[PDB]
Symmetry: C3
Subunit: 127 residues, 3 copies
């Protein structure tokens, strides 16, 4: 049975919520105030640790508003189901304008994507 | 219930998205406009479509491989919720020093209906060790 | 039942491996020495061809380390389940420093994501949603 368990690592953390009833993702909020330099990057802590089920992973996905309005998008973003460290969001600034993330800003959305993980079979012929 | 992909044309310029091979992941998205993605910049390209995909999925607007190598084009963000009924636009980022020209009808992205789970969020005191 | 078939196209190829029992991705290694130029791009060969099952595709996904240490992101990355050509990794460099790729370096990770591929139908109107 699917689950999404979240542990607050500080009092500043915001428990993720979905934005609409059928929404794909859980909104993630910044636990800090941080500059994202023009044509540069920032690593934004959520002060959360998580667990998601085997047969899935948590993808840190971009919010469309951040991307369209501010040319900000998300690098990396693959959180394994057994990763128990703090969840941070890597933002890339694809513009010549400096940007600033404020404490509590929603900076990404977490999507729990279904996957398969079979053992690899090496072959001489794929078909 | 069986999966579905319904599309509604918002103008005559919209093109029904079509897959590219019988096992292909995604449905090709065509531009409804003439436009451009400026060098080192971005654009929102209308498809003039509204869509519906099933609960337990979302529609991901994903980059085409050819455009990524030839024009350094990427999709800046492409999460479309299963309950999103607004117009579908494609956000393109141009990671090169030359403009990318868009003519109406041009394929600019592909849509992939990804399976997900959406359980309730549960705050906990401790997580298991791995 | 899911599978992941891999064919090596040369001796330089490395069978993709998963790091831990619950890891999402299979690490992909470069088959070449190469460079991703500052603010530029490169197509890095793996010298692999692959097959994944119907109802999935293989997503070429970024490694977190390369993203943060080198501003490297993966472009493109949608590998169809019936694509039988060579698998190359498209890297974008979002920094002003060249990124060197050495033979055997891990440059991405492959994730076999579950999808649906229903027959698309045009309709006159869609349901409006409480949103
Ligand atoms: Mg995905």
């Amino acid at each position: 049975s699917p689950f999404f368990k979240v542990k607050k690592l500080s009092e500043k953390a915001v428990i993720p919520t979905r934005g609409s009833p059928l929404s794909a993702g859980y909104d993630l909020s910044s636990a800090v105030d941080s500059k994202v330099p023009a044509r540069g990057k920032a690593l934004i802590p959520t002060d959360l640790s998580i667990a998601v089920p085997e047969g899935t992973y948590a993808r840190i996905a971009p919010r469309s508003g951040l991307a369209w309005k501010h040319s900000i998008d998300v690098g990396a973003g693959v959180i394994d189901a057994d990763y128990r460290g703090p969840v941070g969001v890597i933002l890339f600034n694809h513009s010549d304008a400096d940007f600033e993330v404020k404490f509590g800003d929603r900076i990404a959305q977490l999507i729990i994507e279904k996957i398969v993980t079979p053992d690899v079979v090496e072959v001489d012929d794929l078909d």
